[PDB]
Design a protein around this nucleic acid. Structure first.
Length: 138
DNA sequence: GGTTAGGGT
């Protein structure tokens, strides 16, 4: 079953719809920052004051970083783009060294977990709440 | 696995 991002808690498998705000690829992994415009007390508070940054929002604790390893990296890195919507299913969350929630997709997860990330066509009606909530923060 | 909310690869 799906959860709003405000409803996810560390160390539990979860599923959610989100919009991709930022991507970053590296030699090690592929990184997404995603939001559904709901607030979570463990997300990192993104600052509007950063001297140099291409982040335009949302600010505060409204987005979660996802680290994609191995097949998840190879699959998404030249596919998922900023502005896309995604559906992430049965993904795990952890707490990093500084105490912030993060979502991780580890390589070769058991088929039984049915863990996945897929792009959602932007015209899909399940994305309506995201688009509506976005209006509160622009 | 990686380090810390940038960079813009």
């Amino acid at each position: 079953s799906f959860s709003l991002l405000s409803q996810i808690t560390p160390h539990q498998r979860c599923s959610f719809y989100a919009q991709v705000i930022k991507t970053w690829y590296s030699d090690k992994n592929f990184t997404l920052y995603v939001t559904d415009y709901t607030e979570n007390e463990l997300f990192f508070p993104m600052s509007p004051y950063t001297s140099s940054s291409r982040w335009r929002g949302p600010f505060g604790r409204f987005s979660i970083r996802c680290i994609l390893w191995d097949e998840h990296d190879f699959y998404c890195r030249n596919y998922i783009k900023e502005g896309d919507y995604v559906v992430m299913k049965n993904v795990r969350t952890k707490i990093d060294h500084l105490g912030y929630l993060e979502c991780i997709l580890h390589g070769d997860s058991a088929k039984r977990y049915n863990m996945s990330i897929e792009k959602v066509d932007s015209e899909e009606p399940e994305l309506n709440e995201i688009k509506s909530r976005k209006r509160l923060y622009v």
